[PDB]
């Protein structure tokens, strides 16, 4: 085509504005940070009936007291393993404590978005800014639970309840009235699975999705297939008792 330095008629890059199309091609995930814990989850779906969901990780862990997720291509998800996970350990290497979620996100965004045509000192060799939507959540030692997100455009915003993926248009619309300040951990476990039911194209299964949580004491803990199936049975019993 032409030089990457070409902007939009509004003065923005093309790869930044077009980075939202690669997110819809990924998996739909909705994070929620309640008063008790922070609800994390994704959607594995299926690429085949012989697909194994045990060895695939769509939800990673940067540090014990925090968590992370991904929606998009899995290539950029490992770029923060050498950056976000390194910066979290670098903080413990210097200040030896839990990094603030508010400061960590902006610190990651410095290591997250770097690109361009070329530069001697900094590495601009990266072409596409992001191919994945990364979620950033955890607990702050001062404020509290904070749910942030790494956007494919590179910016960052404070999200009380965040929805990403292809179904983020219809899920976030109803999410306004669903999220409340009184929403607890147990009440938010059946709420996410109920929203993902209208999202997921197939029957809810332990291998078609993965959920986890962020605890201020035990830390990031994944939900095992035996435990995930329990939340599935609780959803079928809850939906039948609504009417």
């Amino acid at each position: 085509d032409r030089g990457v330095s070409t902007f939009s008629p509004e003065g923005r890059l093309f790869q930044v504005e077009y980075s939202l199309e690669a997110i819809k091609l990924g998996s739909t995930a909705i994070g929620i940070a309640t008063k008790e814990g922070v609800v994390l989850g994704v959607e594995k779906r299926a690429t085949s009936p012989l697909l194994e969901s045990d060895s695939i990780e769509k939800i990673v862990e940067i540090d014990r007291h925090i968590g992370c997720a991904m929606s998009g291509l899995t290539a950029d998800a490992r770029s923060m393993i050498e950056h976000a996970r390194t910066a979290a350990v670098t903080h413990n290497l210097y200040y030896d404590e839990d990094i603030n979620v508010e400061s960590l996100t902006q610190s990651v965004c410095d290591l997250a978005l770097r690109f361009g045509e070329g530069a001697s000192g900094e590495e601009r060799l990266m072409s596409r800014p992001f191919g994945v939507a990364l979620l950033i959540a955890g607990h702050d030692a001062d404020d509290g639970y904070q749910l942030f997100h790494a956007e494919p455009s590179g910016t960052f915003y404070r999200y009380n309840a965040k929805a990403i993926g292809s179904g983020s248009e219809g899920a976030q619309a109803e999410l306004l009235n669903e999220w409340h300040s009184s929403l607890t951990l147990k009440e938010a476990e059946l709420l996410v699975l109920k929203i993902l039911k209208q999202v997921m194209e197939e029957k809810l299964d332990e291998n078609n999705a993965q959920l986890s949580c962020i605890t201020k004491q035990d830390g990031f803990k994944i939900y095992d297939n035996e435990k995930t199936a329990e939340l599935i049975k609780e959803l079928k019993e809850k939906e039948a008792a609504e009417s």
């Binding site: 509004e10 504005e17 939202l20 956007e151």
Partner: protein
């Protein structure tokens, strides 16, 4: 034809506004500062599309905001988009 300046674009808009009915709330030096490198061909489309914004609102005459809405009309690619602003 040189690039019309602030006071230059004002005198051009005064020609097409003779048949226009306004509320006398318009400042000529105010609208020209928001415009940059807009010739009389592009300045004429501002006064024409100004009343079209008030067409859906049922206004009897254009106002100072309707002339700003003329810039909101899509000519130079002034329309909206997604991401950074919403």
């Amino acid at each position: 034809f040189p690039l019309p300046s602030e006071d230059s674009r004002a005198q051009i808009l005064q020609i097409h506004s003779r048949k226009m009915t306004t509320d006398d709330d318009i400042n000529w030096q105010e609208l020209a500062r928001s415009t940059d490198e807009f010739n009389g061909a592009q300045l004429k489309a501002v006064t024409v599309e100004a009343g079209m914004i008030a067409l859906r609102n049922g206004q009897s005459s254009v106002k100072h905001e309707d002339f700003v809405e003329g810039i909101s009309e899509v000519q130079a690619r002034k329309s909206k988009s997604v991401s950074f602003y919403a």
